Amino acid sequence: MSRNVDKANSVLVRFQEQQAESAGGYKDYSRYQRPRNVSKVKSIKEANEWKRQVSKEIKQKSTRIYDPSLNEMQIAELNDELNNLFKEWKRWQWHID
Amino acid sequence: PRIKTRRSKPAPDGFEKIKPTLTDFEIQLRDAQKDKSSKLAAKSNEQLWEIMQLHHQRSRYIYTLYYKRKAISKDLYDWLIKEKYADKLLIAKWRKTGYEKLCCLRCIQKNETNNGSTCICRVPRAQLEEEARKKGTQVSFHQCVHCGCRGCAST
Amino acid sequence: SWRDKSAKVQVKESELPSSIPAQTGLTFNIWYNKWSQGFAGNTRFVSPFALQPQLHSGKTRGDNDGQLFFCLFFAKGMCCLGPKCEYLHHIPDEEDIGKLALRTEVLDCFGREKFADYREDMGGIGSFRKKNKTLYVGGIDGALNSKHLKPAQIESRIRFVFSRLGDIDRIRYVESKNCGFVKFKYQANAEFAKEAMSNQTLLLPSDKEWDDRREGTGLLVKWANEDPDPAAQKRLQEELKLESLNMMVHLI
Amino acid sequence: KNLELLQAQNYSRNIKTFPYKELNKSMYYDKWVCMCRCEDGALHFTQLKDSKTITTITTPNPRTGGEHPAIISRGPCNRLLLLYPGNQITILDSKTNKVLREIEVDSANEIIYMYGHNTEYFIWADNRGTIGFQQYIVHSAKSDVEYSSG
Amino acid sequence: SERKAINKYYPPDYNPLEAEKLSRKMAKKLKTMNKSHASIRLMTPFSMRCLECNEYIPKSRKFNGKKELLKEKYLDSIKIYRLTISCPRCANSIAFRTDPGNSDYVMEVGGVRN
Amino acid sequence: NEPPPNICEQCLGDEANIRMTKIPQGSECKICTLPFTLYHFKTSKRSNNIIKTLICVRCATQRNICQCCMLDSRWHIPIQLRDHLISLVVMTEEAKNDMMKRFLSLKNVKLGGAQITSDPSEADNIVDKLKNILLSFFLYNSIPEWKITDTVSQLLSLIVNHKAKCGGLRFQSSELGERFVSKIFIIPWSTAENIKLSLSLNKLIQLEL
RNA sequence: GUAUGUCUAAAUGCUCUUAUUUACUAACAAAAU
Ligand SMILES: [Zn+2]
Ligand SMILES: [Zn+2]
Ligand SMILES: [Zn+2]
Ligand SMILES: [Zn+2]
Ligand SMILES: [Zn+2]
């Protein structure tokens, strides 16, 4: 399990995380992938967390896309990615509450 | 008390009479000796104070029966002393003049204190009160941080 | 009139004063009392208690002995010592302020060292360099559980909470910034107010979201970074001048 | 003609603990009656089905603010259903002390009934008569009633 | 605390099978582990030119690549891999495949061998 | 070697005997964050709460202040105020930086003004100069609410916006109000024209944002 | 000797597969009869 990722997703760590989730309510919304279809999330806190995560992602995307080699295609691709992120964020701002 | 290990003989004559009085104390002690999650410094201190008081009280009871009331045999008293029940030094202090009402020994360790003196408890309420009156303020101290002893003095 | 109003206080009994931390992290660090191996959680949670001062405020073990400093816990609204507390339980009156006005430079009305530099977030116990009586209120959205209220209503609510807590100089709610500036007469009073209203809900019993006030995040009450718009500045300057004049008079 | 005192304890009268049925090592059901004392961030539950056996189980209280569940009900396999204000339900394993699931029930009305020995689903009910299994809704909320129990 | 640590501490209740099951349940949800292009450190055997900016990355030069499994195996039961690299100057994704028929590699729309 | 503590007369107390303990490198000074000896005294034996020194002697010297009070050694005024007065007749800029503050502390220049305060010559002169220099109901028509409240009390919840200049006092009692009216700056119930105009303008301003 | 750095506003249970590993790390060391 060299290079840290393996360590992170080693069974023991996972178990610990699960335990934390069970007792006290420590989740790491960084750690899990954000769900595709909203309205399968009855809790508000979770939703908020997800929204926050997406915002963070968007910010990250923004930070990188103004790099100096602007003509490279990665940046262009991200522009679409950025849009997608924005859309997701908007969706997360649903009007149930 | 310590634990019996056939070192000293089980007990002298009149222990059966007093035992039920000083066995109430044990229960109290047990209640005291544990995690009262005090969550607060003052509260924590209070339990210690209570414990100290309890310790004092048993000794006083013993002392009272042996010296003042004199209803218990010398041998029995000696045995008690040998055991952890009574405090020997405390008893001695009590027996001496000016120390009869005495919360605990470490309230008269002059070495201990930051200012080279005894605990305030040892000041008779009278004097402190008088001082307060002279000043303008009301009665200043309630109980010391060693042991809860509102007006320990012999007065 | 706190003296003749009551003696007793007993705000939150020592059975239930507080649980110790709130689980961020995986493991609990014994030395810092803070959860470790992770940081996910906005952390600020609403006070379970509050200072309803008219009910609570009272004589203390401190009052009799001649304590200067007021009870932080009382302010927060959770002083389990109550009448046997050594710190004072009332809203800082003028006389009291006057009495501890010598010390009020170095340390707060709670008897705890004011710092030389402000905290970067203006978040707690103000600096001794800059005297202040002026509190930033914030997180009013969060403190009201995202309620669609009128700004005016919010302002009124703020006034109600803060007037009770101390002699007000002046208050401003702002729609654009989404905040509530308050200014007091006495720094001590301001400090007390801050202590009280840290992590407090602005909601009332009559509101429909009273039972879920705990689930939100409380008021973010902090110190005021001075207002830049010019009239205010001018006023401040004038005040300073007046103060200087007073000082001069005292001297001569 | 004779009675004896077996037990005295404090409890939390606002924690609604439903009596759970259970099958004997013989072939009938005993009603177990249950009481909950929520103190110092722990839950304490004194149960009995008769005068011969009184058990008390201790569990931590899952909520970080240490707030009390309104309703508590047993599920299969050491599952404990804990209903919290705002219609939030925590399933806790009573043997491991682990939090298994956190469910937010989708109802503006206060949940007033929650039972777990119905055995893949539990049943809950609104103060307006919404009844759901957890999932599906067998009955919708009425405007003209209020319930406090079930 | 020391790289050759014999036994990692477990909680007093740790049903290992159960734990494993739990992990599995929370592996589909997991971000890492449920993804492709897992990282790797590799030296470049081909010694090739980055097709965009013509940067002549020579033999044995070390990179933090991404190894990903190609689903279409060679023959039957011997896997082949895509091994992503970036050129030092321009950030163009070079990669290559390991077709083991010739005991060597194949370039994959990154650069050219020379 | 160590220099002595600079504690003022009002700081220290009113008595002819005080006992204090010195705690060498006790705490870091608040200004400089640099170890120094804490002196802490109890004033009167029995009077509660200690008075610990919060600053290093050097820093005190530089600012010319009580090591407890944080006030001018001479005039007993907050550093700002004392310095401000001097300026009126230049002020200190404490540099609020981890490293730089320490450096500043170690410098021995008497920062700004302190010199004047120290010397009988200079302080006195400054003082002289200063001397010379010296020698329900809505409410309409800036001043603080604590003054307004006081005024109301004298006359016997009190809302007042300043951008509006519109103070809606609510005693919530018909007795208090009817006493208030008889016992007596426009004050109706729930150059006049000019005033009205100004008020209107204020209202407009309030309402545009 | 398992490198590193920036980046952070405050669906539920179910089971079935194994005589393995898309395993990762190379700082460590390098010869014949
Ligand atoms: Zn004593
Ligand atoms: Zn004592
Ligand atoms: Zn004493
Ligand atoms: Zn208190
Ligand atoms: Zn002083």
Quickly give the structural class of chain A.
mainly alpha
Number of strands of chain A: 0
The fraction of residues in strands of chain A falls at under 5%
Largest β sheet strand count, sense and barrel closure of chain B: none
> Whole-Å distance between the termini of chain A?
44 Å
Number of domains of chain B: 1
Q: Which ligands, by name, code or SMILES, are bound?
A: zinc ion
The succession of helices and strands of chain B, N to C, reads HHHHH
Oligomer: part of a larger assembly
Tell me the series of helices and strands of chain A, N- to C-terminal: HHHH
Roughly how many Å apart are the termini of chain B?
31 Å
Biggest chain pair interface: C-F, 45 and 41 residues
Main β-sheet of chain A, in a few words?
none
C-alpha geometry of chain A: flat
Protein model, in words:
- This is part of a larger assembly, with chains A (97 residues), B (155 residues), C (252 residues), D (150 residues), E (114 residues) and F (209 residues).
- Chain A has helices at residues 5-8, 11-22, 44-65, 73-92.
- Chain A has 97 residues and is mainly alpha-helical.
- Chain A has one domain.
- In chain A, α3 (44-65) runs antiparallel to α4 (73-92).
- The radius of gyration of chain A is 17 Å and the shape is flat.
- Chain C is α+β, with helices and mostly antiparallel strands and 252 residues long.
- A 4-stranded antiparallel sheet of chain C has the order 4-5-3-6. In chain C, strands 1-2 form a two-stranded antiparallel sheet.
- In chain C, β4 and β5 form a beta hairpin.
- The longest helix of chain C has 22 residues, at 230-251.
- Chain C starts with a helix and ends with a helix.
- Chain F has 209 residues and is mostly helical.
- Chain F has a domain at 1-135.
- Chain F has helices spanning 9-12, 57-63, 79-88, 100-105, 114-118, 120-134, 145-155, 174-183, 192-208; strands at residues 20-28, 35-41, 51-52.
- Chains in contact: A-C, A-D, A-E, B-C, B-F, C-D, C-F.
- One zinc ion (ZN) binds at residues 7-8, 10-11, 66, 68-69, 71 of chain F.
- Chain B: Pfam families: BUD31.
- Chain B: One of its GO terms (cellular component) is spliceosomal complex.
- Chain B: Involved in pre-mRNA splicing. Important for bud site selection.
Give a quick set of tags describing it:
6 chains, A: 97 residues, 4 helices, 60% helix, C: 252 residues, Alpha-Beta Plaits, four-stranded antiparallel β-sheet, two-stranded antiparallel sheet, 11% strand, globular, RNA-binding, Splicing factor YJU2 (chain E), nucleus (chain F), U6 snRNA binding (chain F)
Summarize the structure.
Chain A: It is found in: Cytoplasm; Nucleus. Chain A: Keywords: Cytoplasm, mRNA processing, mRNA splicing, Nucleus, Spliceosome. This is part of a larger assembly, with chains A (97 residues), B (155 residues), C (252 residues), D (150 residues), E (114 residues) and F (209 residues). Chain B has 155 residues and is mainly alpha-helical.
